[model samples]
Target: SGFRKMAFPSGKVEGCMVQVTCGTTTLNGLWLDDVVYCPRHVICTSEDMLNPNYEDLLIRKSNHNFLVQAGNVQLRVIGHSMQNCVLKLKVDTANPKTPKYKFVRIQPGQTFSVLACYNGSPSGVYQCAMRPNFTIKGSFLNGSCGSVGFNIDYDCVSFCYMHHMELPTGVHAGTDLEGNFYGPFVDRQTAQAAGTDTTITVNVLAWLYAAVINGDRWFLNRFTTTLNDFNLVAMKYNYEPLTQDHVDILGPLSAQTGIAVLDMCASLKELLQNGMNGRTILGSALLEDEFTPFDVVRQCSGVTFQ
Candidate 1:
């Protein structure tokens, strides 16, 4: 965590520099009078191999402009722009040689925000520039950009219990089979023990969505390669593809909305966590694997099992 001066002759850039051993360095930002330029490059490290489950998006803000780029690591622009300054954004794709690039320009009085995911890829770079040498002040985040909220009107638990398989019993779990069944339930009566049904058959889509919702930490330490793969999981597993029921339960899991996949996964996990609150969250034997074709939909689909 040290800052040293390094010069880039082409552009008059000023910002923080993140330097690591082995000469690996990253330029986190460049603040100029009437303009603040911030760029973030997210690199997928082999450490992701240790625990494939990880956060998937980088959210950054410069002046009033915000940029969300796709990646399995966490990152941000490290400088402040002048108040009411213009913001410039630059993002890079997975292909560096022919690196597909995106540029976004934001006005001083304008509120601009974006979260981007590419075709079959979940990694990218994000950059932002703001003019006038100060952070943009206002209710921009809450007003300029909307706060994220989701409504879950569908019950995957009921759907899963009725459709998927169940688990065996463990201990008293709570009190008895009459009350709440914990772990796995051996009997059907005990399985549906809680008046609300104790068993919850977790779905792959739900799991994937949860991961996107919880940024910086992949849910259950599991990893899926792409955004579309999630949809493919539904198609291959026949687990209620993007139907009204799915929307009601998960509230629009589509990538078309521009919500970063990381945020998407995180939101889904938060939804599931809230739904499972105060309930017997069975930890084992909850997978509904009857429909999964392991060989057909390999990669990061259902059968991967973390």
Candidate 2:
């Protein structure tokens, strides 16, 4: 049998119109169409049976009302043309318990917003829940979810040394020699006796003093090299005045120069005392040589001297 196209009834504008197209034994009815009106009649005719069964069926068409059956109860989706529909479950049929279960039916391109709360013991089982307030459909957007927790201490020194020691200038070896600069004279005794008035000893000591006072580079290099060869460390105490023992070693040579080694010793001590307080003493040209007549007078003018 050929299926005839159905049309709306006369004076029935497109929607509320229910038209039946009759075939050999089948009657097809177009119950609803373009207009916004729904039919009031139950329409239990042979024609209604030809259309699909509405019982237990959930219809989600844009502008149509539907009847859905749950167990024995029939619930109607009154067509207000909403974006989504939600279904909630309660424990008691008459008086629901504190906690409730909820689900949502959203359109193909729509999303449903939800906020679910759990009060009693968590069901150890994982249950899918929906948000009641917001909706976003299509591909689920990538998102992130996590939880952060810090302590600090304060105690430190404030003062520090600001100035570094200034290196001596114009340092060089052999500058402190006397009497035409004799041989290397290996032994300390020979070097001491080689020239009149402990010339070699005084020369060496003067060079060391110049290195300390002016921090001469060449003097430091030579002195440090000598000390290193002897596996000796230069002791600052060796330069201490009055208390230093080296004065006795140079005393005999001092007599020839008429300058007391103890006077040089006392001057060196004074310089060291000032250095301990962070004072700087410039080098003197007189001190550059092994003997200074002024030093001799200072030591010889003592009251005990006859």
Candidate 3:
């Protein structure tokens, strides 16, 4: 919070200097722009931990570009296959006579317009349920789920964060059953609940693509780590190789025209151990163990009934 006095070649200067990650925007373009509080001495800022010369490839945390689109937008189809395609888009003011279209590339069927729109800026969030009309199964959107079915908060972070129950319920949860429902983050149990692995793999890959496109190594590092976690968890239990679903998940992704599949799961292990300028995300259970077992609530009940 405070700085110190440094003896320079000619004189002395006063200020505190701490390194923190201030993404490319330079703290909304405020760093060093002012002299009194910001001071010219600070480079990125007191908290500029972001690796220099690297591009940030993640979506802006502020969702800074959203506008209240009030009409049915004519989706600009970027590319498509079977029953689906990607919208190619805008931020705009709607006219009473004209159709109001946000035109922002929503990447899905059921698009979104922020529920809270003020005169010139946006504020917080509501449940903006992202129940997309369909899902991108791979290079194509299916009639099932949509991107980011995980962590659905209608906030600035609409940019990211995200799951699946690849395994069906009932008896399938037991390791004795199919295997055991492992979590998306490897932070949970040991089973493949519903479409868990497939979902996690696909979801993380989405982040990776976002990271690559946005030049955000922070995200890239995290997603690859998640992949490693998926690898390790599968290996640890001596369970069925995740590769079956893994390959299935990675294969159809090639049809996605927007991204490059260069150093993917093929070299994921090495990259996890030695990638530079990349801060990997720590994967945990996308879904926690539903049964805390017999009790984080063991009731020894009633007035000394013991």
Candidate 4:
């Protein structure tokens, strides 16, 4: 029997890539377990971060029928990365009920024209979706579950002729250098339909991206120097406001690299209250002068001994 980890090409494939790997617990024949970390001061703590396994290669197929032609629209890839990656395409029409999709990964790209179709279809306004099919060794895709679903709202280029998509992924991603043959490659005609509600969502995304990525904080006031209108319809749609919960659920990322770090876990307010209480006992108007960020921590630690 053979085992392998599988994942489709999509968002972050490295630092931001969110993929899971699993398989047989035993190798040739053995239990796999390691040290677990402890969380405390001045003590050695560790955990079983790894349990190695057998190697496998990713498998993917591509239909050469889809064709792209530069016309009323275009699909553009921005940047420099290996020809290896994953893809997701969504076709959205003028209807609000239409579908949309957007894919992110690391790569470099070029423009092109498609000469054929995948299954004899025309450029369309279809709601496209995919369930990545993977097989163990060469057997058929197994199990009813585990397959993933992605929105084609962004990646779907709408007008492709029976086109297909993918990004380089899975545990086998690295092992099969030859698999680059199936890398993501499509054309502007099929990629630029800008289907569905995404037309505005993309605009708002641009602004927030500008605000968040660059941490301009005040970009709205100072930005938008372009002669063209960016968020004409987006401004009224009113995307959800950022919340503390958003910051918590996602990461608390800084705008720039070398993000500063300060790990803290405590309720400083109670300690400050205690400091005020102690000061009031000493004088009629005891100025509760402050010290440092750790002042409350110091006070809290001192009380435990008393």
Candidate 5:
């Protein structure tokens, strides 16, 4: 497998980037994790007053092993007994050959806070790790020792296209003499025109149409290719009639459109039973009389379905 890139949330005082590449095929691998810290502290007890809080203790020490300026950076370490652990912070000086610079350190159960005035080029990445052989490692380091805390954000876009008429979700006033809607029949016609086998074509069209309508891109892509074998078999075998139940599950149309579709399913069933292998005769008749239709029944004034 290739390296996977992951981004963290945005809007932070500091930023970081991480890159991971596995050279060996071993089960155990090294990965990176980032940590953040706060530099300020509050005296919790009189013992803190006598001994000084970790933050104040570190602030008073300027000759420590780690070099941190006055009043510019903050460090916060969290975890049970973390205050008792020693933390070493290092920054890369950009000199690839010699990239180690001591940033700061925290005593066990104490936080090391700093305020620095020097803002020279940011000394490479900073890292922290626990010391004295504790179970938890230090949290900061330089270069690619592990990982760093940074900011990031992600945005995604999607689109869809339709090849057939969709069924409505709600009811409408218009009605056919047989109480059927025309949308489902239109869908069937479009699907059949695109292929010879009714069942296979119906399923393919249904799956494609449903995927787009329901925004199921993952399932759509998986089954669209995985079921190719079944589709081929369906194409070869003249299967059973497509019923309202099948359409109910496969069709993306709403109840109103579904009612119309059920009527078309019934009509198609009748045509198939009579050995008609092509378009429905009623459909043909309607197409032929599309321009020659004229009928009106006025009772107690007038009303139109539209």
Candidate 6:
């Protein structure tokens, strides 16, 4: 009684993140009809301009749990009015039996359908169409099947956790707010046993910058907690922490009033972490080449779309 056929225009030329969902199985087709786009102009005008290495769109699996096999993907190539183009469809799978590369030599207005398979039910599909008005459409199938029953592998969760702070109950990697890579340990004690430096970095502004630019909910939530965590830890540990660091972090945005912007970040971060903790959530922003850093600042800060 609560089901409906959903359809919409999605994806872009640069790339798009694909997540595994339940409806991808028996209940739905998850069809992506007429999902299309184009490449640069030069590739369309001259056949020689086609780069063997160029891929117009890359469909990568963001959810690293179950297998995601492509049910069907439709693609078309359009050249400069009269000429045609040949496209490449690269399917990368863990299975050694299947060939990794496939070339779809298509003409203008002629569409081709390809099945992207993966080993153990998961893989990557790379579509390369070098033309002016190249288009692609695809849907997911066979992602979570077998004893998993579409609910098993879906239970796994992983994310970047602060090494110095309290850790959660599941498997997670460590990042001390620094750019360094740490263990994806089984437990907190396991990470501690490795003797990795537990020194915490309190750079909230850099995290705020990454959170806004990437629209990353995880980092955004981390940034918010770090705001309170720094103060709490400073007093408890008997170490002098800088109060000016907060003000100095916002120095570049003096005219922009970082406090108001930080407030927006705090509000969204709280709303997301508080209510949506148990489920999968996807948040995205239009941060293409055309959109500037200030655009993300305005959008994430709620100055543009509230």
lDDT of 3 by residue, 57-95 (tens): 222222232111222232121221111111111222212
lDDT of each: 0.23, 0.22, 0.23, 0.19, 0.23, 0.25
* Model 5 residue 33 lDDT score: 26
- TM for every model, in the order presented, reads 0.17, 0.15, 0.22, 0.17, 0.16, 0.22
RMSD of each: 23.8, 47.2, 25.3, 25.5, 28.0, 19.7
Cα error, candidate 3, residue 117 (Å):
19
* Candidate 5: residue 22 lDDT (0-100): 16
lDDT of 6 by residue, 1-306 (tens): 111111111121002111222122211111112111111111221232233222331222122212223333222222111111111112233222221222223321221122222222223322211111222223233321110000001122111111111223321222211212233322112232232221112223333443444444343333443445444554443322424454454444433433343443453345333544453323323111111223224334544210
Q: What tens digits encode model 4's per-residue C-alpha lDDT throughout 60-173? A: 212111111112222121211112222221112121222232222211111111211111111111111111111111111111111112212223422111122222331101
Question: TM-score: which candidate is best?
Answer: 6
Off by over 4 Å in 4: 1-117, 120-236, 241-244, 255-306
Candidate 6 lDDT: 0.25
Ranking by lDDT: 6, 1, 3, 5, 2, 4
Cα-based lDDT at residue 243, candidate 6: 49
The Cα error of candidate 3 at residue 246, in Å, is 4.0
The worst-scoring run of ten residues by lDDT in candidate 1 lies at: 156-165
Candidate 6 lowest-lDDT run of ten:
144-153
Runs of candidate 3 with Cα error greater than 4 angstroms are 1-199, 215-241, 257-263, 275-306
What's model 3's overall lDDT? 0.23
TM-score, structure 1 vs. true: 0.17
Q: Model 2: per-residue lDDT, tens digit, 235-299?
A: 34332122233445455445644445444444443433343243322233222222222222222
Question: Which residue runs does candidate 1 get wrong by more than 4 Å?
Answer: 1-209, 217-242, 252-306
Tens-place lDDT digits, model 1, residues 1-306: 111111111111101111111113122222222222321211213343232221231233232233322233222333332211112233222212221112223221111111111211212211111111112211111011111001111111000000011222211111110111122332122333312222111233433433333332323334323434444543443333333343344334444233444344344444344443442212322322111111112212322211
Candidate 5 residue-wise lDDT, 1-306, digit = tens: 111111222212122211211121101001112221111111113244233355554554332222222123322222211122112223222112211112222221111111111121122322111111111122222221222222111221000000111122211111111212212222121222112212222332332233223332221111122133333433344542343454554333423223233333333333334434443232232111101001101111122221
Summed backbone clashes in each candidate are: 31, 9, 36, 37, 28, 5
